């Protein structure tokens, strides 16, 4: 199964947003 590699990019997926949010001053 694919589930924890998965999960890997969702995280990459949320810290890119977090990132996304901070470039914005938000």
Same mark, same amino acid.
């Given at each position: 199964? $694919? =589930? $924890? &590699? *998965?999960? &890997?990019?969702? +995280? *990459? &997926? %949320? %810290?890119?947003? *977090? =990132?996304?949010?901070? +470039?914005?001053? $938000?």
């Amino acid at each position: 199964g $694919t =589930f $924890t &590699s *998965d999960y &890997s990019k969702y +995280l *990459d &997926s %949320r %810290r890119a947003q *977090d =990132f996304v949010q901070w +470039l914005m001053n $938000t």
